[PDB]
Design a binder for this molecule. Structure first.
Ligand SMILES: O=C(O)CCCC[C@@H]1SC[C@@H]2NC(=O)N[C@@H]21
Ligand SMILES: O=C(O)CCCC[C@@H]1SC[C@@H]2NC(=O)N[C@@H]21
Lengths: 119, 119
């Protein structure tokens, strides 16, 4: 569940080794910072503002990749559900969409990210 | 350009006839309301809180379908870019990811919405 995190600072890591530390409030508001480490992508290592909402078994959150130190001219939004693991707490299983305004003006890619809890 | 919407509050319609009012602050933060009017979907005709972030010509925002009136046990997140139409106006081209929990566990649908500025 995501209500079972109300006012808790939680770090998570996905299969590409990106890390996010989200702050879920009482109401379900998510705030936090995301750190990208995915090979073949920009803005790796530095922290980016993250915001969205959690409720029950589902969550959605967003990161624009400008932090006033590296601008990738892009944005990522995740929608995902809670998958409980056999003694590994819960996971956030997601699909992302990354838009970028680069060379070919605008483009949009999609992929799967699975985020594992780290106490 | 999305930076040019700082301190504005603008209205947008997608092809499904869903609506969003989006408040953009000085530092690019997006807050506002989504009203789903998409056929064959739940949580229709009701206002849901949306948050996100805009910068240059990219935007990302999400909506959990739980406002404490109607809860469809789902969450959507959008990412995309500002396009200038030949028509003369401006759209937000986006990919969305709908996460929901159903008959046998968590699921994730995906699709494309194009949002049109109402003046
Ligand atoms: O390279 C960019 O334009 C900004 C960073 C993009 C990294 C993407 S976002 C989706 C995927 N999951 C991650 O953890 N990182 C990559
Ligand atoms: O049916 C649900 O579980 C909640 C409403 C989902 C509506 C989706 S969000 C993506 C797409 N774009 C819209 O404007 N409506 C649908």
């Amino acid at each position: 569940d995501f209500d079972s995190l109300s006012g808790t600072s939680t770090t998570w890591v996905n299969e590409l080794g990106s890390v996010m530390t989200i702050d879920v409030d009482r109401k379900g508001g998510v705030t936090g910072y995301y750190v990208n480490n995915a090979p073949g992508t920009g803005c790796r290592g530095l922290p980016y503002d993250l915001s969205g909402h959690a409720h029950g078994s589902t969550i959605a959150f967003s990161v624009v990749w400008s932090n006033g130190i590296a601008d990738c001219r892009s944005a990522t939004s995740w929608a995902g559900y809670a998958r409980k693991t056999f003694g590994g707490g819960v996971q956030i299983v997601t699909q992302w969409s990354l838009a970028f305004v680069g060379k070919a003006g605008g483009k949009i890619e999609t992929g799967q990210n699975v985020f594992t809890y780290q106490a």
